[PDB]
Amino acid sequence: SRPILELKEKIQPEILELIKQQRLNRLVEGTCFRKLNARRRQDKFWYCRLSPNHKVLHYGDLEESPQGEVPHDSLQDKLPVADIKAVVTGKDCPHMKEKGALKQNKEVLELAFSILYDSNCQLNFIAPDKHEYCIWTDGLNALLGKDMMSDLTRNDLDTLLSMEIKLRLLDLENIQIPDAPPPIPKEPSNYDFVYDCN
Amino acid sequence: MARWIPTKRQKYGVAIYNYNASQDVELSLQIGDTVHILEMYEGWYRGYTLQNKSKKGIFPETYIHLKEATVEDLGQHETVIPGELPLVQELTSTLREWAVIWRKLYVNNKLTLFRQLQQMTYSLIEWRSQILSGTLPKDELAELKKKVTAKIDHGNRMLGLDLVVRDDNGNILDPDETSTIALFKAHEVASKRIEEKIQEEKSILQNLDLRGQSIFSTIHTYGLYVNFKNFVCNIGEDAELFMALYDPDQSTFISENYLIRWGSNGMPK
Amino acid sequence: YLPSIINDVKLVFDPVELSVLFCKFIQSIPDNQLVRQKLNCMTKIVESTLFRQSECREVLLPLLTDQLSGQLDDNSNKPDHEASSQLLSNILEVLDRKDVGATAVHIQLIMERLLRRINRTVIGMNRQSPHIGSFVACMIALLQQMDDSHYSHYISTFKTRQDIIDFLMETFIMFKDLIGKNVYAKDWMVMNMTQNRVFLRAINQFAEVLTRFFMDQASFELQLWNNYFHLAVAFLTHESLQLETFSQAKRNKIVKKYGDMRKEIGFRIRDMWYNLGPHKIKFIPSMVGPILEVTLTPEVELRKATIPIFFDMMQCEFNFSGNGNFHMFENELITKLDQEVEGGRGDEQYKVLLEKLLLEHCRKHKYLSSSGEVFALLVSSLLENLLDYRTIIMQDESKENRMSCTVNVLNFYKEKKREDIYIRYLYKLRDLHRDCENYTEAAYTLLLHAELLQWSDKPCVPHLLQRDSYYVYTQQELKEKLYQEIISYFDKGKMWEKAIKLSKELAETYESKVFDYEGLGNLLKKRASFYENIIKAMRPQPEYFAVGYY
């Protein structure tokens, strides 16, 4: 499977942009994320819609909506996509560092993400579970246009590439690919095709 | 390059690996890029591709795996068995459409039915590969044909895709404008299988006995497999174990008694 | 069980003697005895022993026809519909066999004995839930197996021309009733094309019978071309590029298996229209629209073929233009062109080719074609306007841009003074603002509509007689209704100054013409209420911002 793998991993990017496109679709459809220590009657759930323009972030303290995203003006429909320094994960979240009233327990260690903007304002938010935590980190990193930090993302990458190459190998049944590519038969220096072009 | 020739014994324009960009009309041709070569050179081949049947590409013979066979598997008698190889080509095209809709699936929140489409896709591809060989006995040929036809038509039906007919031999003889009423009832049998499967997702996926009753309504003889492991008793003498089926309601036995000799040492004689 | 023996007993007997014995046995059933069961009997009968027919079919069927024609229309057809359909199917299949023996003559006998029959049936047998699909399948199988010579044999050679006229009219209307309101799940794709092709064949044959017995040959009774062309268009109005586009092979599969059948329909209608000749003008204003949408097919060629027909009909009017010109033509032209284009149908290349062709034709022709040149110039402007409209609609989908572009097209129409479509788009905006509660803006637009009217009683134009309710509506009364609505708006529009303004001339009209003193009372009640509102309540000041686009 040597040239097989060479070809498979070598034709990477199409699946990559496909997965990233799906991630943007996911951020756009979004959901109600989670706040910090929203216990004494606080809307822990609150929708965070990425624009179909993928530039504004329709997020803010929306109600305990079980339906999730509701298309309207959130509290702050804008998070500047360009200036986001990064998102801190786990202990790097200063809200995870908080040990007072907003002390997040160790059971949300992987749900802690703070989106960096204004260099003094943070988005200390919580995911409902790890997989979509990684999903939204992947989505913002697609906004960052970089690698993806979801385990599920590599899962989908490898599996879909596997099926694609697996369906690719249909025309080449009962054939071997020499690991050294077959020698290109010499092209005669004349391009005066005896039979016409097209 | 010169001396190109028109021919139709190259329909399987076959790559080897992702081709070099050596020609101005060639790219890293996919492994599954069956291309319609129009013009034939000895060591080279240029013509249409499945990727773009309106465009040429000069492909090496050392890269072209020549297959004189064409879309018809019997004119050159390429059939490992006649009337079947069609089936693989249209199911492969069907697989292309499953790939397209697969793209349509992940990008949407159909991931449950999408995942079940994944698993039937994998069953389809493994059946495809196993029937690539002609080693099967003809009964199993028919069995695989019908089961995969049901699966692919199921794939069509939750995807609302159009219907096919001619259950046997490539699903194509009927759409060859042979009759009308036989065509009508072919469509009717198709709809009948449609209703069968649409009523049976709720019958099997959720329930575990309707499938059993439907299976038991098709055959009339059965057998119970008993795999004895060890006898737990304290006799110390030879024991002759008469085990069989009994009808307590009728106070009678139902199967002949299977005599088992159990030894005096606790382990069967 | 009597059929259960026919095979082997024949294998040891004379064919025809046994055959006639069974026939005489069957006819000896009185008309009310086990009709379904006799149908099953004879169905098993025609099943076997009909593999040979030369000695039997010509004598076996006669009885079968007799009993089926009794099954045609006796108001006792309700139980035997399914079984008769079954028998019809089986016998037609047996006919469809080729090894079975020659049956062409027998085929025409089958028409001559069952065809008007099944036509009557399917016309009356006309509810979708029952097995009407089976009847349809049978009759299309028929038309498939038939022959043009057979169609022309007697179906073209009936009794008096009125009978054949009425029969063909019924045939056309039920064709329309099938094509329109299709009888399948749209999943039975294959039979859908087969049905399309067989209907193609049939409508072809009826086109030639119309030509041969119904051109200026029948110099009169030329009305039914209405029905013919309407059905032709409706049939032509489906199974197109995108519908052929779903799978990639879908185009290819259909083209190989069926080609471009709509191409055939287009050419057929083109030559037919050309054949109309002198009666074209006698027929234009109805058919005007019917040709545009089919011109608007997403294809290229039959389009190429169809645009010149516009020049053909304007030329025909030019022949009639001894009085005026194709005003009446171009009006419906523009109107329908609007409805279809705003429906989201055409394309740019379309309008390009339209202008090119029409100008090319008008070069061949005279002054009236120079006028037609300026008219089609206007037309092309309209087309690009609407195309821009729809591209922006699909580009932004924010109601504001929709409002902008529709305002643009209102301005264009006001320029073009085709006041009807003008009003139409006005009401579009009225709906829009109602959605946005721009009671002020909505009332303004509604007023612009009302602005056109006069306090004259006479409804001088049914153009303004809209689709909200279409009857007499004496003009001043329509004005009155509009004014009431506009007042209601302004009142909830929190802007009573215009309310009072309008109320003044409303009350004037009352006292001067209708004397509707109760209406005076209500109106002045409202005016006083609004004056109170003004003096009493306070309303917010709206900020005004400037936007500089760059």
mmCIF file of all heavy atoms in Angstrom, chain C residues 66-84:
data_model
loop_
_atom_site.group_PDB
_atom_site.id
_atom_site.type_symbol
_atom_site.label_atom_id
_atom_site.label_comp_id
_atom_site.label_asym_id
_atom_site.label_seq_id
_atom_site.Cartn_x
_atom_site.Cartn_y
_atom_site.Cartn_z
ATOM 1 N N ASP C 66 -67.581 -8.009 -26.101
ATOM 2 C CA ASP C 66 -68.987 -7.785 -25.796
ATOM 3 C C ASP C 66 -69.172 -7.539 -24.311
ATOM 4 O O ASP C 66 -69.785 -6.549 -23.893
ATOM 5 C CB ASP C 66 -69.810 -8.990 -26.237
ATOM 6 C CG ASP C 66 -69.522 -9.395 -27.658
ATOM 7 O OD1 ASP C 66 -69.092 -8.527 -28.446
ATOM 8 O OD2 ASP C 66 -69.700 -10.587 -27.985
ATOM 9 N N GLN C 67 -68.610 -8.421 -23.501
ATOM 10 C CA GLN C 67 -68.794 -8.317 -22.064
ATOM 11 C C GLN C 67 -68.029 -7.137 -21.483
ATOM 12 O O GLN C 67 -68.502 -6.504 -20.537
ATOM 13 C CB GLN C 67 -68.396 -9.639 -21.431
ATOM 14 C CG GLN C 67 -66.974 -10.004 -21.693
ATOM 15 C CD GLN C 67 -66.697 -11.433 -21.353
ATOM 16 O OE1 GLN C 67 -67.590 -12.165 -20.930
ATOM 17 N NE2 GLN C 67 -65.459 -11.850 -21.535
ATOM 18 N N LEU C 68 -66.878 -6.789 -22.056
ATOM 19 C CA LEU C 68 -66.178 -5.597 -21.598
ATOM 20 C C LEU C 68 -66.943 -4.328 -21.933
ATOM 21 O O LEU C 68 -66.964 -3.391 -21.134
ATOM 22 C CB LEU C 68 -64.781 -5.542 -22.203
ATOM 23 C CG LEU C 68 -63.681 -6.115 -21.311
ATOM 24 C CD1 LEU C 68 -63.556 -5.268 -20.054
ATOM 25 C CD2 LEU C 68 -63.954 -7.562 -20.947
ATOM 26 N N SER C 69 -67.559 -4.273 -23.108
ATOM 27 C CA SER C 69 -68.346 -3.108 -23.478
ATOM 28 C C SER C 69 -69.619 -3.024 -22.654
ATOM 29 O O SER C 69 -70.123 -1.926 -22.400
ATOM 30 C CB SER C 69 -68.671 -3.156 -24.966
ATOM 31 O OG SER C 69 -69.503 -4.264 -25.248
ATOM 32 N N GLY C 70 -70.168 -4.167 -22.251
ATOM 33 C CA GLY C 70 -71.196 -4.139 -21.224
ATOM 34 C C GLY C 70 -70.651 -3.591 -19.922
ATOM 35 O O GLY C 70 -71.310 -2.809 -19.233
ATOM 36 N N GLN C 71 -69.424 -3.976 -19.586
ATOM 37 C CA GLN C 71 -68.712 -3.450 -18.436
ATOM 38 C C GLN C 71 -68.358 -1.978 -18.596
ATOM 39 O O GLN C 71 -67.946 -1.346 -17.617
ATOM 40 C CB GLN C 71 -67.459 -4.296 -18.212
ATOM 41 C CG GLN C 71 -66.784 -4.089 -16.886
ATOM 42 C CD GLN C 71 -67.770 -3.854 -15.772
ATOM 43 O OE1 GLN C 71 -67.810 -2.775 -15.198
ATOM 44 N NE2 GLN C 71 -68.582 -4.856 -15.469
ATOM 45 N N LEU C 72 -68.510 -1.418 -19.793
ATOM 46 C CA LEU C 72 -68.182 -0.020 -20.022
ATOM 47 C C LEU C 72 -69.009 0.939 -19.185
ATOM 48 O O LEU C 72 -68.481 1.609 -18.293
ATOM 49 C CB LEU C 72 -68.386 0.346 -21.490
ATOM 50 C CG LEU C 72 -68.050 1.818 -21.687
ATOM 51 C CD1 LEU C 72 -66.605 2.032 -21.344
ATOM 52 C CD2 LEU C 72 -68.392 2.301 -23.083
ATOM 53 N N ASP C 73 -70.310 1.007 -19.460
ATOM 54 C CA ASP C 73 -71.150 2.016 -18.820
ATOM 55 C C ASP C 73 -72.545 1.418 -18.657
ATOM 56 O O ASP C 73 -73.373 1.477 -19.568
ATOM 57 C CB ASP C 73 -71.186 3.310 -19.616
ATOM 58 C CG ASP C 73 -72.126 4.334 -19.012
ATOM 59 O OD1 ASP C 73 -71.884 4.761 -17.864
ATOM 60 O OD2 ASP C 73 -73.111 4.706 -19.682
ATOM 61 N N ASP C 74 -72.784 0.846 -17.485
ATOM 62 C CA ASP C 74 -74.103 0.372 -17.092
ATOM 63 C C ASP C 74 -74.399 0.729 -15.643
ATOM 64 O O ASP C 74 -75.348 0.199 -15.057
ATOM 65 C CB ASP C 74 -74.219 -1.135 -17.319
ATOM 66 C CG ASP C 74 -73.016 -1.891 -16.809
ATOM 67 O OD1 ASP C 74 -72.017 -1.239 -16.449
ATOM 68 O OD2 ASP C 74 -73.068 -3.136 -16.770
ATOM 69 N N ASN C 75 -73.575 1.598 -15.053
ATOM 70 C CA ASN C 75 -73.732 2.063 -13.679
ATOM 71 C C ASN C 75 -73.580 0.912 -12.693
ATOM 72 O O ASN C 75 -73.779 1.086 -11.488
ATOM 73 C CB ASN C 75 -75.080 2.761 -13.501
ATOM 74 C CG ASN C 75 -75.314 3.831 -14.545
ATOM 75 O OD1 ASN C 75 -74.375 4.309 -15.183
ATOM 76 N ND2 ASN C 75 -76.573 4.204 -14.736
ATOM 77 N N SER C 76 -73.233 -0.266 -13.199
ATOM 78 C CA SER C 76 -72.880 -1.419 -12.387
ATOM 79 C C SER C 76 -71.409 -1.750 -12.582
ATOM 80 O O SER C 76 -70.964 -2.876 -12.360
ATOM 81 C CB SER C 76 -73.759 -2.620 -12.727
ATOM 82 O OG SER C 76 -73.528 -3.065 -14.050
ATOM 83 N N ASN C 77 -70.640 -0.753 -13.016
ATOM 84 C CA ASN C 77 -69.224 -0.944 -13.290
ATOM 85 C C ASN C 77 -68.367 -0.920 -12.035
ATOM 86 O O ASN C 77 -67.192 -1.297 -12.100
ATOM 87 C CB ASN C 77 -68.736 0.122 -14.273
ATOM 88 C CG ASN C 77 -69.592 0.192 -15.522
ATOM 89 O OD1 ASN C 77 -70.113 1.249 -15.878
ATOM 90 N ND2 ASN C 77 -69.761 -0.945 -16.182
ATOM 91 N N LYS C 78 -68.934 -0.512 -10.903
ATOM 92 C CA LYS C 78 -68.141 -0.334 -9.691
ATOM 93 C C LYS C 78 -67.375 -1.580 -9.243
ATOM 94 O O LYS C 78 -66.194 -1.434 -8.879
ATOM 95 C CB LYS C 78 -69.048 0.211 -8.579
ATOM 96 C CG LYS C 78 -70.409 -0.458 -8.481
ATOM 97 C CD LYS C 78 -71.358 0.304 -7.577
ATOM 98 C CE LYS C 78 -71.929 1.509 -8.300
ATOM 99 N NZ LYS C 78 -72.680 1.106 -9.520
ATOM 100 N N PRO C 79 -67.938 -2.808 -9.243
ATOM 101 C CA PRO C 79 -67.173 -3.936 -8.696
ATOM 102 C C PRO C 79 -66.113 -4.448 -9.654
ATOM 103 O O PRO C 79 -65.005 -4.813 -9.247
ATOM 104 C CB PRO C 79 -68.250 -5.005 -8.448
ATOM 105 C CG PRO C 79 -69.571 -4.341 -8.785
ATOM 106 C CD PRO C 79 -69.224 -3.290 -9.768
ATOM 107 N N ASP C 80 -66.444 -4.466 -10.938
ATOM 108 C CA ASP C 80 -65.624 -5.125 -11.938
ATOM 109 C C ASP C 80 -64.513 -4.247 -12.471
ATOM 110 O O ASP C 80 -63.825 -4.659 -13.402
ATOM 111 C CB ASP C 80 -66.487 -5.596 -13.105
ATOM 112 C CG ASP C 80 -67.408 -6.727 -12.727
ATOM 113 O OD1 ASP C 80 -67.052 -7.508 -11.822
ATOM 114 O OD2 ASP C 80 -68.489 -6.833 -13.342
ATOM 115 N N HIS C 81 -64.334 -3.042 -11.936
ATOM 116 C CA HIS C 81 -63.295 -2.168 -12.460
ATOM 117 C C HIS C 81 -61.936 -2.842 -12.386
ATOM 118 O O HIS C 81 -61.219 -2.950 -13.385
ATOM 119 C CB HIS C 81 -63.288 -0.854 -11.689
ATOM 120 C CG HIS C 81 -64.336 0.105 -12.140
ATOM 121 N ND1 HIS C 81 -65.268 0.645 -11.283
ATOM 122 C CD2 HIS C 81 -64.614 0.606 -13.366
ATOM 123 C CE1 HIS C 81 -66.067 1.451 -11.959
ATOM 124 N NE2 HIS C 81 -65.693 1.442 -13.225
ATOM 125 N N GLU C 82 -61.587 -3.334 -11.200
ATOM 126 C CA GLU C 82 -60.281 -3.947 -11.008
ATOM 127 C C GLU C 82 -60.124 -5.210 -11.844
ATOM 128 O O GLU C 82 -59.084 -5.412 -12.479
ATOM 129 C CB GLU C 82 -60.061 -4.214 -9.519
ATOM 130 C CG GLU C 82 -61.085 -5.129 -8.877
ATOM 131 C CD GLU C 82 -60.740 -6.587 -9.032
ATOM 132 O OE1 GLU C 82 -59.558 -6.892 -9.290
ATOM 133 O OE2 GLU C 82 -61.655 -7.427 -8.918
ATOM 134 N N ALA C 83 -61.152 -6.054 -11.888
ATOM 135 C CA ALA C 83 -61.017 -7.317 -12.602
ATOM 136 C C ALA C 83 -60.984 -7.096 -14.107
ATOM 137 O O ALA C 83 -60.232 -7.765 -14.823
ATOM 138 C CB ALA C 83 -62.154 -8.257 -12.214
ATOM 139 N N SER C 84 -61.799 -6.168 -14.603
ATOM 140 C CA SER C 84 -61.768 -5.819 -16.012
ATOM 141 C C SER C 84 -60.424 -5.233 -16.393
ATOM 142 O O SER C 84 -59.876 -5.554 -17.450
ATOM 143 C CB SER C 84 -62.884 -4.826 -16.315
ATOM 144 O OG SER C 84 -62.728 -3.656 -15.528
#
